[PDB]
Symmetry: D2
Subunit: 296 residues, 4 copies
Amino acid sequence: MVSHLRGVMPALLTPFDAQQNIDRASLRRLVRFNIEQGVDGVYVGGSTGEAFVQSLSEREEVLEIVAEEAKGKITLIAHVGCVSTAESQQLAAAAKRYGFDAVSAVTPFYYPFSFEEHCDHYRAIIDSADGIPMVVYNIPALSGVKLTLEQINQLVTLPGVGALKQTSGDLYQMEQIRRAHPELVLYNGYDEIFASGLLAGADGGIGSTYNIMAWRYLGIVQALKEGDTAKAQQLQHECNKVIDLLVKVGVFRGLKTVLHYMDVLSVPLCRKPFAPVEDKFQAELKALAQQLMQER
Amino acid sequence: MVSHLRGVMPALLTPFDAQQNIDRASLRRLVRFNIEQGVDGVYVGGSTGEAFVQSLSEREEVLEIVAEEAKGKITLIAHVGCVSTAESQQLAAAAKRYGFDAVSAVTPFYYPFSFEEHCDHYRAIIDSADGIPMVVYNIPALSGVKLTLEQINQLVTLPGVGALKQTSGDLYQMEQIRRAHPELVLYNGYDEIFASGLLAGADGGIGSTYNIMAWRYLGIVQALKEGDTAKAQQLQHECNKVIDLLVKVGVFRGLKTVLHYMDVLSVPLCRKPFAPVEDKFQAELKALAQQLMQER
Amino acid sequence: MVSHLRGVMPALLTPFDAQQNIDRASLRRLVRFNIEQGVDGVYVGGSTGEAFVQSLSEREEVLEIVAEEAKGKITLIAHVGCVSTAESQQLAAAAKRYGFDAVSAVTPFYYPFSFEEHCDHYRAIIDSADGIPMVVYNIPALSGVKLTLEQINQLVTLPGVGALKQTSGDLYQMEQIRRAHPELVLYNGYDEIFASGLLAGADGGIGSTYNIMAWRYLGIVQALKEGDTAKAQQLQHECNKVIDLLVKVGVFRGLKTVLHYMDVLSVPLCRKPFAPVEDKFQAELKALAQQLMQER
Amino acid sequence: MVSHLRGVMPALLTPFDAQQNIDRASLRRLVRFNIEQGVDGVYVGGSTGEAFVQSLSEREEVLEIVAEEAKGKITLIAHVGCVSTAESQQLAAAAKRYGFDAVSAVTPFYYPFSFEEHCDHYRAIIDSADGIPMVVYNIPALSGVKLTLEQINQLVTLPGVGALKQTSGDLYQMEQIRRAHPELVLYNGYDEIFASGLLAGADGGIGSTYNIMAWRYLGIVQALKEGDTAKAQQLQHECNKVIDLLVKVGVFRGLKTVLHYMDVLSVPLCRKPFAPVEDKFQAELKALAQQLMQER
Ligand SMILES: [Cl-]
Ligand SMILES: [Cl-]
Ligand SMILES: [Cl-]
Ligand SMILES: [Cl-]
Ligand SMILES: [Cl-]
Ligand SMILES: [Cl-]
Ligand SMILES: [Cl-]
Ligand SMILES: [Cl-]
Ligand code: NA
Ligand code: NA
Ligand code: NA
Ligand code: NA
């Protein structure tokens, strides 16, 4: 009863203005741009949205704006996760008020928590979400949390959990999760292995690079559905040429810079301590924006 | 010109009341209790203070209260670190207003930052600290940040840096830091190796377990100064028997529970997602409080 | 000019008798069994062959026996790798004498070696191989060696290197290697991600579980060639149900036990310190052998 | 009843000649040199002895030569460890024949073994050692084996185990081991933390750098016994200046080069794939040899 959550959803970036304040006008334009890429949903306030250098009120502000542009048109998922359970609950209650279709929360980090503490954290947020489903979000590389398969199985069967965001490159585990849970909504988290992650059992994806080239990932979905192995590989090749460059320049600010050159974002800054893009990369990023716009 | 920062300083816990709100009365009593243990300073708003499940305004509130009880009596160090540079600067400016003697900031975490981004982060906070010195705080285990010796050397020679909080069990690196920087204020971060860390080159310590037994760590300092090898080892043995138990029960909540049984804190709760202490451990923690009070 | 090395090749197990001596008769039967599975080659004396609990003379003995059964019928690859360069060269010269088509060597382990020391190690073995090509074998999980993409690129372009055995679950790196080297023979090393690894750029595989079910992996190759996405996934599912069980029971001894129940190996023991299979797993392993024999 | 195993023992290097063959004459001179440094024992055939690039017969040859020079004069410990249990047993039986006072074995590596497989491995070697005690050797950094405290406790209480070689920088665990086992012979393994490791509970050490400056480590033992904190720290400082240089140049070959400049070893080569020392380091290593000889 949550199959409406399956698909390809950009992890929304949060545009900032020249003084590191939220750029509300560019945020609305980014939502509209992603809708017009034909995505299945948007994922708001995640790591990629620079949530962990924003206050709670800033995160709520972003959630409400995105709901204003996109409620009813595409699926809306609110990443409400903080280290604090009480802070996460406040964002879940807000997401509910604004009409989101699901909430999500990263495994709480920095401090070591027991597995039962993780489960109670999710249970508390689910209660505050007041009837909209929860997406468990697994990103061991950044969170430092290293869950076992059996712990993942317990999380995805918690009452109120409707999906798993699997930000892991271990595609044995992806296949095991799919085999244990054939109906589970299972998002591939690393864009650079999207085609292989779908083959291993994911049925969708949440990704930062979908903000600039969602049609490629939709094309990978279509290629594997149609049985065009070689087209899925060629599309993944092109995605990874782009990801190579983004890793070199810095991923969030590279994506925001490409979006600026596509006339989507007025100002491409990340918040400190992220530095601005080095001048020597600007030509490459502008050429990529031009390439991507022509490819459409 | 910052030798006044050397010594043994508890990493202050933040007392909460039964509804997870700050317990201001127990906070003031905890400051007074630590002063009367004869410590050299207190370290406020660190990891141990549960900073990362508090808002900025809550952290400022704690800083100002502690300064009200302790300014002028002992050294005050404010941990102002957040992921965000701008948030860290706000806390540094506040710490300056409240009369702290130093600020400190954990290496920003969750997101990968370049080393130069780390340095600019520290430079920005130092500027907002408006003339009080900075303590670099290294805790690779929890931050995920794995600095090299040469990067540590560049951080401790940044203008405005007066100390290093070395929360690392690598005592080769402790000795290398001391040999490269003979005048550096160098805090041992892991209480469970305090005696060995002093021998390897630290000249003080910042520790969570000093809140319940600072006299033991002061006694280790005195033993090594006097050349009583065996007394330093026996004191460290007793500290580690306590740390063994705290790890079993959960360190912050175990410390708060011992302080409650010493009539220092009215309520020993941590914030969610930390669970309360299991009932089966209460007898041991109360017996430890009684042991520690008699030992004084 | 080494496209004849592409394909699906079992990592041969080394059968031992009841007293931990090589079982020469069961070895010959295992080679013949693998040939009659329609594999493209066999990979002899690797990790899976328990090379690192055998002497050099025992490894040479196995190489020569396998060449006697299989030279001319299928591709033969000799894993000659040791920590010692001189020991590896002896095995390479032997493999050449016995008529192998390629040699392979794991990155030397236990001791830390510089990257240039690794390259000179490969260069020395290539020289002793006396004109047959080298397969670089990357297994960071077991070797502790963590090569970068640029170092991999330098290894696969060493004169005399004809292939890379990529025993890594990082399928971003698999795709990068393929994109940098479109003609490279690129073996997937983890059987549990075979379908996804082929999609990411591998054009074959070397695997321990091919000894008991090579037709499934050949079927995955055929399915992806034909564009039958769902059949590749179903075959991988069945492989991983088997791999799940093998991990539970111990992989090498589980494989040898299944082969014993298929009447291929007389005795299914590994060498100490590998323990024998626990009695409680025997029913499951015998049922799997019966299932696999009927499936053919 | 194994207190005769406590103390400071060099991890003997194995001298090779110009063609990578064992240099028997320089081996005997190295044993004699170490005896005349006043060490408590010698540790033969360990990692430092380049055991894992030698055959079994080469290791036996080294064991027997060292016993010929040193049996009866100082304690002799034979590192018999291999991955194979049967190979380790052969070396243990040989060590017994040659009159060694103890055997030692690294936790078997490369392949994952269960803890019970590790214990049975030690039990088998102890049986072949035929009444001389076993030293468990823990070096997680190089072995990849990450034992828990409770597993260490089970190993050191196996019948026939008389000591633990603790090659770990975790001095919390060192203290826990000492507190659990007050009579255990407990060797510090990382020379660069020797003083701190003794303070944390070790009562001796086995180290590669003792081959060139054992008197410094004996002086650290004496300083801590006498209560001269500052002298132990100054000696450790000087040791670590040397270790810094050895890490830069390559530790085994740097040590052998210093010994060559002290007229102990005729030829300072390691076996391939270890490269020779770079020419640019020779001046520093010769100056260190001259410094060390004058310091005596
Ligand atoms: Cl936040
Ligand atoms: Cl973190
Ligand atoms: Cl905070
Ligand atoms: Cl945070
Ligand atoms: Cl071997
Ligand atoms: Cl290893
Ligand atoms: Cl050996
Ligand atoms: Cl080996
Ligand atoms: Na949708
Ligand atoms: Na003070
Ligand atoms: Na072939
Ligand atoms: Na002795």
